[PDB]
Design an enzyme around this catalytic site. Structure first.
Site, PDB file in Angstrom:
ATOM      1  N   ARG A   1       0.744  -1.292  -0.029  1.00 34.61           N
ATOM      2  CA  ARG A   1      -0.041  -0.064   0.155  1.00 34.61           C
ATOM      3  C   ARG A   1       1.051   1.283   0.023  1.00 34.61           C
ATOM      4  O   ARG A   1       0.620   2.182   0.777  1.00 34.61           O
ATOM      5  CB  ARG A   1      -1.008   0.199   1.162  1.00 34.61           C
ATOM      6  CG  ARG A   1      -1.923  -1.183   1.450  1.00 34.61           C
ATOM      7  CD  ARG A   1      -2.884  -1.294   0.526  1.00 34.61           C
ATOM      8  NE  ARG A   1      -4.077  -0.904   0.871  1.00 34.61           N
ATOM      9  CZ  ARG A   1      -5.138  -1.650   1.055  1.00 34.61           C
ATOM     10  NH1 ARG A   1      -5.275  -3.034   0.686  1.00 34.61           N
ATOM     11  NH2 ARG A   1      -6.256  -1.273   1.662  1.00 34.61           N
TER      12      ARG A   1
ATOM     13  N   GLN B   1       0.849   2.188  -7.001  1.00 28.43           N
ATOM     14  CA  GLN B   1      -0.612   2.429  -7.656  1.00 28.43           C
ATOM     15  C   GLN B   1      -0.753   2.022  -9.068  1.00 28.43           C
ATOM     16  O   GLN B   1      -1.874   1.671  -9.383  1.00 28.43           O
ATOM     17  CB  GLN B   1      -0.966   3.819  -7.231  1.00 28.43           C
ATOM     18  CG  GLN B   1      -1.629   4.205  -5.961  1.00 28.43           C
ATOM     19  CD  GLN B   1      -1.647   5.685  -5.612  1.00 28.43           C
ATOM     20  OE1 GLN B   1      -2.569   6.531  -5.508  1.00 28.43           O
ATOM     21  NE2 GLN B   1      -0.408   6.204  -5.394  1.00 28.43           N
TER      22      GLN B   1
ATOM     23  N   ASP C   1      -1.302  -1.590  -9.122  1.00 26.13           N
ATOM     24  CA  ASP C   1      -2.126  -2.061  -7.919  1.00 26.13           C
ATOM     25  C   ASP C   1      -3.666  -2.505  -8.471  1.00 26.13           C
ATOM     26  O   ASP C   1      -4.341  -1.519  -9.066  1.00 26.13           O
ATOM     27  CB  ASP C   1      -2.445  -0.761  -7.151  1.00 26.13           C
ATOM     28  CG  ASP C   1      -3.505  -1.084  -5.872  1.00 26.13           C
ATOM     29  OD1 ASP C   1      -3.677   0.038  -5.207  1.00 26.13           O
ATOM     30  OD2 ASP C   1      -3.546  -2.179  -5.614  1.00 26.13           O
TER      31      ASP C   1
ATOM     32  N   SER D   1      -7.323  -1.117  -6.852  1.00 25.95           N
ATOM     33  CA  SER D   1      -7.595   0.104  -7.363  1.00 25.95           C
ATOM     34  C   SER D   1      -8.288   0.252  -8.634  1.00 25.95           C
ATOM     35  O   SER D   1      -9.228   1.047  -8.733  1.00 25.95           O
ATOM     36  CB  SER D   1      -6.520   1.051  -6.918  1.00 25.95           C
ATOM     37  OG  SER D   1      -5.970   1.377  -5.688  1.00 25.95           O
TER      38      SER D   1
ATOM     39  N   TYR E   1      -5.897   1.186   5.411  1.00 25.97           N
ATOM     40  CA  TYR E   1      -7.293   0.541   5.665  1.00 25.97           C
ATOM     41  C   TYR E   1      -7.801   0.504   6.869  1.00 25.97           C
ATOM     42  O   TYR E   1      -7.206   0.761   8.001  1.00 25.97           O
ATOM     43  CB  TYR E   1      -7.127  -1.147   5.272  1.00 25.97           C
ATOM     44  CG  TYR E   1      -5.792  -1.699   5.678  1.00 25.97           C
ATOM     45  CD1 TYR E   1      -5.162  -1.625   7.101  1.00 25.97           C
ATOM     46  CD2 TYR E   1      -4.879  -2.243   4.618  1.00 25.97           C
ATOM     47  CE1 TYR E   1      -3.923  -2.239   7.290  1.00 25.97           C
ATOM     48  CE2 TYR E   1      -3.666  -2.937   5.134  1.00 25.97           C
ATOM     49  CZ  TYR E   1      -3.331  -2.883   6.297  1.00 25.97           C
ATOM     50  OH  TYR E   1      -2.229  -3.581   6.955  1.00 25.97           O
TER      51      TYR E   1
END
Ligand SMILES: NC(=O)c1ccc[n+]([C@@H]2O[C@H](COP(=O)([O-])OP(=O)(O)OC[C@H]3O[C@@H](n4cnc5c(N)ncnc54)[C@H](OP(=O)(O)O)[C@@H]3O)[C@@H](O)[C@H]2O)c1
Ligand SMILES: NC(=O)c1ccc[n+]([C@@H]2O[C@H](COP(=O)([O-])OP(=O)(O)OC[C@H]3O[C@@H](n4cnc5c(N)ncnc54)[C@H](O)[C@@H]3O)[C@@H](O)[C@H]2O)c1
Ligand SMILES: NC(=O)c1ccc[n+]([C@@H]2O[C@H](COP(=O)([O-])OP(=O)(O)OC[C@H]3O[C@@H](n4cnc5c(N)ncnc54)[C@H](O)[C@@H]3O)[C@@H](O)[C@H]2O)c1
Lengths: 174, 359, 378
Positions: free
Chosen positions: C127, C132, C135, C138, C235
């Site tokens: 994370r 990203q 990922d 997402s 999270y």
């Protein structure tokens, strides 16, 4: 035989006023003048002036025509009012900012029995202290009939494209 | 007087010719308002909501209609010939207001005439400014235009809006709206607000500016081979929505099978004219059909897919039409000089009266 | 060094792990790129588009994987007892990259381990901000957030936007989004696009401003607990039965007036938190719609059932499985680029090799088996 007027000096009239009702119509949709309209509105709220939009049931050319364009320019729902909840408030307002509307305001709907717009309830914009119509020309609306409001003492015309005129007014507000 | 609203009995009709707001208005005019139980279920209007407004609940259709001086419904009443005689439930001499489809359904007009029912066909409302509030064609079509986009987006396997992300960019959907009436305009608005690039075409001149007033692009040729310009965009289109309609005539063919073979696979067509033959001949009523990689969607009765918003609007149209004629002193006099009354009256007191139906 | 991508044989799974854009990039790295016949049909990717970009085409699953040094899939490969034994089609010693499932899918992991196959589990992507682009949670949940609003509008018997009309005003639909992660933010944006009035809530404090930037109004429950609700991973944690009650009371004032409720709340390694109980559904308007995107992890509403639409108390509770596959032709190119971005940095190129760093936490927080050893901190 009608009274004219230009972009200049409509900006302080609203800046000085306590209350203004915006009355959008088809012409507003044609020019896509709605992003400029919303920015013209919240500079006013930043001044402390109270702003509103009056939506006729048949503004534009389809149901909800003004709503989708106003929503796209991010106008808050709490400032948008239908004909029945807003009509009485024109009495108490210094300015009626009419942008691309015409038939929607036309008093021959209450008077003149033998007219094409007769019986259709209208927005009573005349009852406001002052009325500004933005439209490119003196040309008629969808009904194809003249509007008496264009020529009286309490009305001032603004003869330009609805997008251009409003953009200009915002710059004069700064 | 008593006024009654039954449940709609035709397959797939979830609308109802009433709302709580309109009930309390009818009471104010001196009506007793009766509705058949369960009538508003598909429109999310419970029996209790109705009773709170001032209405009475009847247990069956027959009982609701038994003593009613005025009857409101959405679709035309079924006849004995269709296996369910709803006309026989209406009291003799009573007044019925609904979407009759009277110019294409003479059998129901004849069955109403036999009971001395005065029927007002709301689809025949005259196109004057003061009757826009009484106009069921536009109130129902508008919601159908919105739905078309929702149905198109459901059946499509890409998102409507452009999205720029860390993993790369996904392009917007390209939508092509054929026919720019009420439905078409609301389809352009709904597609545009969802992020799609929207192209539209119509035969009529004045439409080009309407399309642009919603941020759409009109298909232009900047003669009779204007199909080249259309096809150039259709070949890039993800969703085609066709809305072109002609009263009492088959719908015009705007997308040929030869044109669908030239579309990209994964594309969807929403044919709002499917009940009048379709603007695409590959569409079939009540079905989603797949040919040449393209889904052709032809749901029936699209306004009933938005029945909970459609029904209040329909009941308001009905109220606006009726209200000027309830001068109590407590009776209903529909004044013949009123164009809204003469344009819409199909049969009266036991005789067919509309000049399109006397022969 | 050649790469092959099969078609998905799993019920409903329409996403493919490839695209024309990506095969063009793989060729540049030094890959012969074979792809199973018709593998991108559900994603609207044609065989001809694969070829032109630079891909050979295998006429079956066993032929594509037969000599493939690397294999890319979307979902874990089916094992012997699932039906067809795809794990065995893969050339032994190859490397396999997908959402292998892992943690909750032990049969597949030991079978790939039996054939020396080095596999990498993309759901376990760190994370950290730089990952990203690699990922998959997402990329896929963003599209599920969009799709939730589309499914809500489809099931709803009303329109979303305010429309003033000659027949009266159509009111706007009121939407409530429970959980404002990647899926929840896109649901807010897509609901606002359609003209809805949008309400939102989340346990993490930083959500408030994100909701307002989209023009939604946020339901503060706070309880002082929203400051210490987000973790070092970003999270949520289990909040407790007492907060849940504080949350349910605050929520109820809007939830009674709400037309569409979209629920997206997840907690890693744990069942999905209950945000709308059956009691709360009973207070809702008839015609209302709940979209439960956490359905495959327990659900935010207990009335939701995976792969079905449930009707109770005049309310539709919708619980589609594999929501990103309902947007499969957008999801797939994005999935294939997640994998490409993960893989590209660890290619030699000169001798056409694949030395996966090992030290890079992107690599080590992902490798579930390597040459016959499971090697993971489970
Ligand atoms: N909403 C519906 O469902 C619907 C459907 C069908 C018909 N209608 C009818 O349409 C009419 C709507 O009334 P309305 O007041 O909204 O429109 P309208 O009465 O027809 O007038 C629109 C005005 O906007 C002006 N305009 C056009 N382009 C412009 C531009 N780019 N910049 C600035 N002004 C511009 C025009 O004047 P210039 O020429 O000077 O620019 C025109 O007079 C009603 O008669 C209604 O019955 C409505
Ligand atoms: O208003 P409304 O809701 O009554 O609209 P409508 O139901 O009459 O029809 C919708 C639109 O379809 C268009 N149309 C009709 N025939 C066509 C053809 N052959 N090609 C392209 N467009 C066509 C019309 O111009 C109209 O704007
Ligand atoms: N590579 C990275 O740096 C990386 C990768 C993915 C996500 N993230 C971040 O992590 C955050 C969460 O994203 P996500 O989509 O994975 O979240 P998620 O799918 O795990 O959960 C969705 C949302 O539900 C919320 N939630 C949990 N319990 C709740 C309850 N009790 N009531 C109300 N809401 C509750 C969570 O706080 C979260 O925002 C985001 O800020 C995102 O940017 C970072």
């Amino acid at each position: 035989s009608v009274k004219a007027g230009s972009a200049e000096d409509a900006a302080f009239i609203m800046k000085n006023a306590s209350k203004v009702i915006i009355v959008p119509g088809y012409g507003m949709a044609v020019a896509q003048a709605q992003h400029a309209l919303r920015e013209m509105a919240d500079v006013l709220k930043k001044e402390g002036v109270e702003v509103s939009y009056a939506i006729h049931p048949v503004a534009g050319r389809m149901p909800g025509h003004m709503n989708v364009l106003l929503a796209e320019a991010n106008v808050p729902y709490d400032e948008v009012f239908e004909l029945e909840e807003i009509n009485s408030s024109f009495q108490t307002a210094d300015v009626a900012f009419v942008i691309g509307a015409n038939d929607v305001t036309n008093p021959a709907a209450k008077t003149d029995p033998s007219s094409p717009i007769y019986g259709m309830p209208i927005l009573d914009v005349e009852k406001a202290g002052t009325v500004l119509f933005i439209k490119r020309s003196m040309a008629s609306g969808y009904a194809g009939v003249e509007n008496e409001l264009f020529f009286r003492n309490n009305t001032m015309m603004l003869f330009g494209d609805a997008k251009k005129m409003t953009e200009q007014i915002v710059q004069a507000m700064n | 007087m008593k006024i009654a609203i039954p449940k709609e009995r035709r397959p797939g009709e979830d609308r109802v010719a009433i709302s709580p707001e309109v009930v309390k208005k009818l009471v104010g005019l001196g009506f007793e308002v009766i509705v058949e139980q369960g009538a508003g279920v598909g429109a999310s209007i419970t029996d209790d909501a109705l009773t709170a407004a001032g209405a009475t609940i009847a247990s069956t259709a027959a009982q609701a209609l038994s003593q009613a001086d005025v009857v409101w419904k959405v679709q035309r009443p079924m006849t004995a010939e269709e296996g369910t005689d709803e006309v026989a439930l209406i009291k003799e001499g009573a007044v019925l207001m609904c979407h009759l489809g009277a110019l294409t359904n003479r059998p129901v007009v004849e069955a109403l005439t036999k009971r001395k029912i005065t029927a007002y066909a709301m689809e025949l409302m005259p196109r004057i400014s003061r009757a826009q509030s009484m106009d069921i064609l536009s109130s129902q079509s508008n919601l159908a235009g919105y739905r078309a986009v929702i149905d198109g987006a459901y059946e499509f396997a890409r998102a409507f809006p452009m999205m720029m992300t860390a993993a790369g960019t996904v392009p917007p959907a390209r939508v092509l709206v054929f026919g720019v009436g009420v439905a078409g305009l609301q389809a352009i608005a709904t597609a545009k607000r969802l992020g799609a690039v929207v192209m539209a075409t119509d035969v009529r001149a004045a439409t080009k500016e309407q399309v642009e007033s919603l941020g759409g692009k009109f298909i232009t040729v900047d003669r009779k081979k204007q199909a080249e310009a259309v096809l150039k965009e259709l070949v890039k289109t993800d969703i085609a929505i066709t809305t072109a309609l002609i009263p009492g005539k088959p719908a015009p063919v705007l997308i040929t099978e030869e044109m669908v073979t030239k579309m990209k696979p994964g594309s969807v067509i929403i044919d709002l004219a499917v009940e009048a033959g379709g603007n695409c001949p590959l569409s079939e009523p009540g079905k989603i059909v797949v040919k040449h990689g393209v889904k052709i969607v032809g749901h029936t009765n699209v306004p009933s897919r938005v029945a909970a918003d459609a029904s209040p609007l329909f009941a308001k149209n009905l109220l606006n039409f009726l209200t000027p004629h309830v001068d109590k002193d407590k009776t209903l006099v529909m004044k013949l000089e009123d164009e809204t009354v003469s344009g819409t009256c199909v049969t009266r007191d036991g005789a067919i009266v509309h000049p399109a139906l006397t022969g």
